[PDB]
Design a protein around this nucleic acid. Structure first.
Lengths: 259, 185, 178
RNA sequence: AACCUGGUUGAUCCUGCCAGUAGUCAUAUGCUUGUCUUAAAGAUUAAGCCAUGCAUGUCUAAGUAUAAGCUUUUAUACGGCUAAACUGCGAAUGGCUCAUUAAAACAGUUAUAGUUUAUUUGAUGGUCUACAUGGAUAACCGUGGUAAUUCUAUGGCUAAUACCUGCGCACAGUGUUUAUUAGAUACAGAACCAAGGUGAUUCAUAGUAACCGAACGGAUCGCGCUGCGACGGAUCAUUCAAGUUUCUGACCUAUCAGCUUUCGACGGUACUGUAAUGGACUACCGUGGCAGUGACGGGUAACGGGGAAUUAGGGUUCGAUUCCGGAGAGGGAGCCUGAGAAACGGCUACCACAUCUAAGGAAGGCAGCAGGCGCGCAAAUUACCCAAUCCUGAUUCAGGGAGGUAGUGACAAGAAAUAACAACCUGGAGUGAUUGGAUGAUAGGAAUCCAAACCCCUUUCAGAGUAACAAUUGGAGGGCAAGUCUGGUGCCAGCAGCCGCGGUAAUUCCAGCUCCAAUAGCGUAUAUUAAAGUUGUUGCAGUUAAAAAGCUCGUAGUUGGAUUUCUGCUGGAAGGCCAAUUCUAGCAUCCUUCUGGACUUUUACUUUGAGAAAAUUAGAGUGUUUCAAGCAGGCUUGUCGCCUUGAAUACUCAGCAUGGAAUAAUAAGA
RNA sequence: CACACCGCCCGUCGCUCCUACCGAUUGAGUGUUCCGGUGAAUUAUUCGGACCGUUUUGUGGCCCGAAAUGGGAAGUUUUGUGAACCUUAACACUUAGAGGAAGGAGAAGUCGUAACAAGGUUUCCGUAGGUGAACCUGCGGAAGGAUCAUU
C-alpha cells in the first residue's frame, strides 16, 4: 500500500531466474528498459549463470570497477534489468554475451563474436509523431529512434548500430519471416510465420511453424521477428529453438550422463 | 474531508453498503470557489502529482472569441445575465462555465472599424480585400451593438484554469437565449 | 516459516488385532531380522506409492504419450533397484510385487546373502558398528536398499578389524596387558 | 484395503441408533525418555494493559568548511582530512496482527479513447550588469530563562545545487486557456470561373486568432581551441506502480417479505469537484430502481485466495499462520509535508486508560524484537552479528531486532542403541546368569565448522559383563490380541467408552506371577474426517418399522412425441501389423464478392489452442551414507577444464478463440 | 406375558432433587444506530496587518518625516469535514422475581384397574360434554377385530 514496494521476495520472484528456495529469504529486485518478469537482473547473471561472483557483495566489487557495459554504456547499478536482446560487454576476457531465451524458457547469456556484438535488434511497439511534426519509433527496449523510413510499421524489428545511434537494417512483419517467441507457453521457440488472425477488438494471434513441422500459436506481443524466410540476422542458442519432446528430452539427457 | 467515494451512500437494491476502511486521500474533494466579478485574485492549489491548479476568486476580464470573424480580444465583464443551472448564481453575479455574461464591445467595434471600415453606429485597398474575403452582421447583433454591450457564453472552467474565457453568441444560440431573457420579463 | 517439506514414511493399519495379519508380519520380522512393525509398514507404504502409480497408468492406453513416458521411467527404477528382473519389463509385473521382494533387497539381507555376517541378527550389528564398504564409502544403516550394480561391491570397510585396521579397543587391552 | 464386530428377544430375521475401530503434516494433558538430522511455538480468551533497552538513518574526485580540530606536506582565494551544522534523499518499504468486513473484500477475466506517476532508460530544445544580481540563516562566539524534555529566547558574524530575483534574434519559441481549420481513401474523369495512427474519436501533429506569468529555455560542481560525468529541471514516451473499472463466483437463517425516496432512492439536462469517469456534489425535471433464481434484515466461536487434512469414485471439514491481495496501529475524527500517507516507532482534538511535577505545567501509544503483569486448558532468551539473503543513502566504505546464528523445545517429521558369536541339557533348529574371548552412550583433545562460540562429519588417549549404561506405556469376560492361575474384599470399596462384573468360591475390583499389543514412545479429553448407501448427484427410505398433503384447480420451477442430404463408387495423404483405424478430395446436378473471409438462424456441448506467479501437490533426473529432504552434481595431474550441464513437464467454473455431420435448446412459418 | 396371569402395566395424590416455562414489578444492567440538541479541533474563505524590504521623495553631511506596495504573524467572518457528550425510542443479549404450572429422575409409599385373552362394557380415531384418578358417555368413522363365508 501507500507507495511502491522496495523489496521483492524469493519464491515470489520469477521461476525462470532459478533462484533456490533456501539460502536467502529475499531475492534481488530489478525499473529499466525492461519489465520485472520479462527481464533478469545483472546480479544473477554474474553469480547464478556466469559463476564469476560467489556473493552479493562480490557483484558490487565487480560492477564498481566499471568493467561491465551494456549497449556500449557502463551501468554501475547491480540490479539493472538486462532483458531480451541486450548485449553485455566485458573488456577483460574480451568476451560478449547477447541474452536470448533458451528453449526450456530461461534466460541464458549466449556467447558471440566481436563484430556481431556491435548490433542488436529492437521490435517496435508503435510509431508516433513528436513535436515540430517529426515522426518517431518506440521500441520494446524503450528507446525512441527518430526520422525512420516511412516503410517501417508496427510489430517489426530494426537492427540498431549502437556504436552510433542510428538504424541500419529494417525488417518487415509478414508470412515467411523468421520469428522467436519472447513470452507465454511457447517461449524460446523459433519458426516461420504461416498466418495471423485479426479478431477486430482485442488480441491478434499468430499460428506459426517450427523447422520440424510442428505448428503452434501465440499472441503478437510475445512474437518477435528475427529475420527473413529462413536465415536470420542473429546467432541462435543451442537447439535453435526447436523444443524437442518430453520423452526425447529424457532420452538425450540420460544418454549424456552415462558418459 | 469531502469524500468522493461510493463506499458511503446506498446500493441500487436500497441496502446500506458495508464500509471497513477509513477515508482515502485519493478519494478527495475540495470546497467550491464560487468565483464572481471584482478585481482579480487567484490562488494556486497544490494537487496530486505535484501539479498546480489555479482557483479563481474574482475575475474582472477575459479572452472572448468572435467565431465567424475569427478573432479574439481581451475584454472587461459587466454582469452575469443568465444561467441554466441556478438562478442564485445570476443573483450574486457568479462566473461559471455555460454562464451567459455581458461584455464591453468597444474592442470589437474598434477592430470592425479598422479591419473593414463599414463601421457601427494606402490601405483602403486592404480593407476592401478583407471585405470581399469576409461584414453583413446579423440583424440582432446590429441592435445589440447599439447599447454598447454583447452577450457571450463562458466556455472555460474558472475553478480549474483560473481564467474566464468564452465565445460571443451568434445565430441560433443568440435567438434562443433572447427568448428566456424576455420570458421572465 | 522455514521452507522445508516433510512427509510420513508409514501409517498404521485400520484393524489393530487380527491373527491372520499379526502372524504373517511376524514371519517377515523373523526372516529378515527387523526391529519393530514400523519397518514393515514403511515398506508396505513404499510399495503402495509404486503400485498406485502403475494402477493409474495401466487403465489408459499403450499408445498414450503419458503412459509411454511415465511407465518407462517407473520400469527403469525397478530394473535399477533390482526389484523386478530385466527379462520382464511389462508394467503389469510391477503389480505382482510383494513386501518380501523389497526386504530381500535391503542391506541386512545382502550382507547375509553375501554371507560375511552369518545369521540375520549379526548382519544388522555389523552394519551399525561401522563396517561394510558399499562402493567407495562405508554405510551405517540397515534399511539402505541396493541398486544391483552396487551389490557385488559390498565389502568390509578398509578401516576396522575385519577390514585390516587397528583392532578396535578391547583386543589392545588384552595385547598390551599381556 | 472400495472392510466392518458388540448391544432390543426364551430364540429368529429386520429397521435402527448407541458403543467399538483408524487418521490429522489439530490443540491440551498424564507417565516415560540414550543418540544424531530437520523445527511449530501468546493465533484461539483480553485488537486487554505496559517498566527498561533496542528496531531508520545516510558522503562521494563531484552541493556549503575560517572547529578558536587534527595532520606532516608548507599552499597570497581554496594543501587533505574531518567533528558540528545547513541542504539533498529516505523515513509511505519492511515487520507485526486478524478486530472489522457477506456482491463488500478477494479470485480469475477485461477496460483506462476516464487518469496521476519520485526514480530508471531513451528522446527532444539558441528566439525571454550574460566576465556573473540580491540579503538572511545556522553550527560557531558571547549569553540567559525554567523544577523538568530531542523546550529554546535576546545579541553579534558567514555560506549554497537553501531562498528570491533575472538582459538574451543565429512583431516573433515551447507550454497553459478558449475559439477553430486540416487530420483524405470502394471510380474514372472532363469543362467553367474567382495523407501520421487505431476495431473505433474532438487522438498524435500542423495551422489560425488572442489570452497569463501562476512553467521551462542551467547565475551549479568535479577530473583533465578540447573530451568525459556529477547534479538540477520541463514536456514526451518507458519502467516500478497506484486509482478507479467489465463479467462470473460465497457459510447458516423465511420464528427475517417486501426494501429504497421530500435530507440521492433510479434516470435526464447544465454546473461544481476530482489526478480523471461518475448522484461524487449542487440546482431544476421525470417517477423510477431491486425482489420468490431469496431483495431488505439477522447470525458467524468469517479477513479472501494460493492451499491443508481426509487411503475407490463423488465428497465432507479446515485455511489467525511462509506467498499474493485487504484492513488496522487503544477508540473514533481531522490534517501538514511529499512522487506517493488521510501515516501513527508524524502532528492537532475529544473520549478511555496512565507517567513525572517544585502543583505553574510537561510529556505517552510493544497487533516491531526480547521481557513482565493479567486472562486463560494453552505458548521460548530482557542473548551474539550484519558474515549469508536483500533493502535504504550523498553510497565499492555507513546502517538494518528486516534477516541470520545460538539458547529453551517429546507441537511436529526422518533415521535407529538397549546386544552379537562361541565352545560346553530338549533332539527332532531352539534353550541354559556355565564360563569364554572378540562398537558409541559418555568425558577430554586435535583439526574442521563458525562473524565469534556451538552442533554435525573425520581421527584420537581413556570408555560394559547380572552389558546397574537395568524400557516404558496400556491391557489379559465379550467386542479386541492375552490367564476356567494364586491371595485380599464381600452389590462394600471400586471397575465399566457399550454389553456387563462385585450380595463369602470374582475368567472384569485391589495386588502378585505369567502372557499379550505397540515401542522411545504410549494412554486420556475435546473438535474433525473415514466407517455413514445413518443426508444418499453417483446412492437410501416412505402398505405394516421414522415418513404420501383429505381432495381437485394452478402460477412460476422442472420435464416434454414422431419428422427436414441419407446411401454408393473412384481417388489422395497417412497408418498400425504380420488390408484394419484415422483424416480428406471428387462424381450423382453443391454457394459465391475476391486473391486467406464473407454468407450457412443463434448458443450450449465437445475438440484443439491462447493467456494464466511461484511455494505446495503429482512428477523427470540425481547414492543428502539411507531417509524426510535438497536442487544439486558428475567426470579428470588439467591451468581460456570439459559434460556447446542440469534445475524437465503437468496442474491453475466464468472469460477470449477454433474444427465438428449427432444430441438439446432457439429463431422462422425471394 | 417368557421369573411365563400370584404375569405385565396405566393415572392422580404424597415426599426429595434437577432442568426449562408463564409471571405483577410502568423490573434490572450492558451493547448497538435513529432523528434531534449542544459541539472540540481543522481544510477553504473573509476581513485583519505584530514588523520584515523594493523603489519614491523628505532631511542630518548613512540616521530619522512620510507616501506608494510585495512577504506575512496573532486575532476574526461564513461555510464544510466533524470527534465527544446528552434526551427519547427501538432492536439485540445476559438477568432477579412472590405465586402458578410442566417434564423427567428417585427406591420402596397411598388409592383404584385402564390397556394386553372377546383383559371380563372389543380396541382405536376425529369432535363434544362430564368425573378423585386412570377414565366414562354422545354422534360419524377404521379394522390395526373377536367375522375374508349362506335367499
Amino acid at each position: 500500500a501507500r507507495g511502491p514496494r522496495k523489496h521483492l521476495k524469493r519464491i515470489a520472484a520469477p521461476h525462470h531466474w532459478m533462484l533456490d528456495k533456501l539460502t536467502g529469504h529475499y531475492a534481488p529486485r530489478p525499473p529499466g528498459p525492461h519489465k520485472l518478469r520479462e527481464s533478469a537482473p545483472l546480479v544473477v547473471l554474474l553469480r547464478n549463470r556466469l559463476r564469476y561472483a560467489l556473493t552479493y557483495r562480490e557483484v558490487m566489487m565487480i560492477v564498481m570497477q566499471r568493467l561491465i557495459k551494456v549497449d556500449n554504456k557502463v551501468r554501475t547499478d547491480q540490479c539493472y534489468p538486462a532483458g531480451f536482446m541486450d548485449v553485455i560487454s566485458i573488456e577483460k576476457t574480451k568476451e560478449n554475451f547477447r541474452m536470448l531465451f533458451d528453449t526450456k524458457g530461461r534466460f541464458v547469456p549466449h556467447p558471440i563474436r566481436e563484430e556481431e556484438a556491435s548490433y542488436k535488434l529492437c521490435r517496435v511497439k508503435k510509431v508516433v509523431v513528436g513535436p515540430k511534426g517529426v515522426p518517431a519509433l518506440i521500441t520494446h527496449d524503450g528507446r525512441t529512434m527518430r526520422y525512420p523510413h516511412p516503410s517501417i510499421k508496427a510489430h517489426d524489428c530494426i537492427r540498431l548500430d549502437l556504436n552510433t545511434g542510428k538504424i541500419v537494417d529494417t525488417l518487415k512483419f509478414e508470412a515467411g519471416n523468421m520469428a522467436m517467441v519472447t513470452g507465454g507457453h511457447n517461449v524460446g521457440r523459433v519458426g516461420v510465420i504461416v498466418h495471423r488472425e485479426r479478431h477486430l477488438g482485442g488480441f491478434d494471434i499468430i499460428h506459426l511453424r517450427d523447422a520440424k513441422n510442428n505448428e503452434f500459436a501465440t499472441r503478437i506481443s510475445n512474437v518477435f521477428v528475427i529475420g527473413k524466410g529462413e536465415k536470420a540476422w542473429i546467432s541462435l542458442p543451442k537447439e535453435k529453438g526447436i523444443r524437442l519432446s518430453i520423452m526425447e528430452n529424457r532420452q538425450v539427457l540420460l544418454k549424456k550422463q552415462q558418459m | 474531508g469531502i469524500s468522493r467515494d461510493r463506499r458511503h451512500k446506498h446500493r441500487r437494491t436500497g441496502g446500506r453498503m458495508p464500509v471497513h476502511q477509513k477515508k482515502r486521500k485519493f478519494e478527495l474533494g475540495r470546497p467550491p470557489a464560487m468565483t464572481k466579478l471584482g478585481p482579480k485574485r487567484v490562488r494556486p492549489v497544490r494537487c496530486r502529482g505535484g501539479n498546480m491548479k489555479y482557483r479563481a476568486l474574482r475575475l474582472d476580464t477575459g479572452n472572448y472569441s468572435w467565431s465567424s470573424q475569427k478573432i479574439a480580444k481581451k475584454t472587461r465583464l459587466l454582469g452575469v445575465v443568465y444561467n441554466a443551472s441556478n438562478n442564485e448564481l445570476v443573483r450574486t453575479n457568479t462566473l461559471v462555465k455555460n454562464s451567459i455574461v455581458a461584455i464591453d464591445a468597444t474592442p470589437f467595434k474598434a477592430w470592425f472599424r479598422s479591419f473593414y471600415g463599414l463601421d457601427l453606429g494606402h490601405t483602403l485597398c486592404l480593407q476592401n480585400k478583407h471585405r470581399q474575403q469576409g461584414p453583413k452582421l446579423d440583424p440582432l447583433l446590429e441592435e445589440q451593438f447599439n447599447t454598447g454591450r454583447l452577450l457571450a457564453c463562458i466556455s472555460s472552467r474558472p475553478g480549474q484554469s483560473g481564467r474566464a474565457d468564452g465565445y460571443i453568441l451568434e445565430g441560433e444560440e443568440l435567438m434562443f437565449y433572447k427568448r428566456k431573457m424576455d420570458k421572465k420579463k | 516459516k522455514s521452507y522445508r517439506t516433510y512427509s510420513k514414511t508409514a501409517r498404521s493399519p485400520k484393524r489393530p488385532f487380527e491373527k491372520e495379519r499379526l502372524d504373517q508380519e511376524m514371519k517377515l520380522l523373523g526372516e529378515y531380522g527387523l526391529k519393530n512393525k514400523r519397518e514393515v509398514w514403511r515398506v508396505q507404504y513404499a510399495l503402495a506409492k509404486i503400485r498406485s502409480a502403475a494402477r493409474e497408468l495401466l487403465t489408459l492406453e499403450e499408445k498414450d504419450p503419458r503412459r509411454v513416458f511415465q511407465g518407462t521411467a517407473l520400469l527403469r527404477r525397478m530394473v535399477r533397484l533390482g526389484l523386478l528382473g530385466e527379462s520382464e519389463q511389462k508394467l503389469d509385473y510391477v503389480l505382482g510385487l510383494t513386501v518380501a521382494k523389497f526386504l530381500e533387497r535391503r542391506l541386512q539381507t545382502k550382507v547375509f546373502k553375501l554371507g560375511l555376517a552369518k545369521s540375520i541378527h549379526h548382519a544388522r550389528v555389523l552394519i551399525r558398528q561401522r563396517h561394510i564398504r558399499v562402493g567407495k564409502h562405508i554405510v551405517d544403516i540397515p534399511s539402505f536398499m541396493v541398486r544391483v550394480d552396487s551389490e557385488k561391491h559390498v565389502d568390509y570397510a578398509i578401516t576396522s578389524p575385519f577390514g585390516g585396521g587397528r583392532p578396535g579397543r578391547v583386543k589392545r587391552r588384552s595385547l598390551k596387558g599381556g
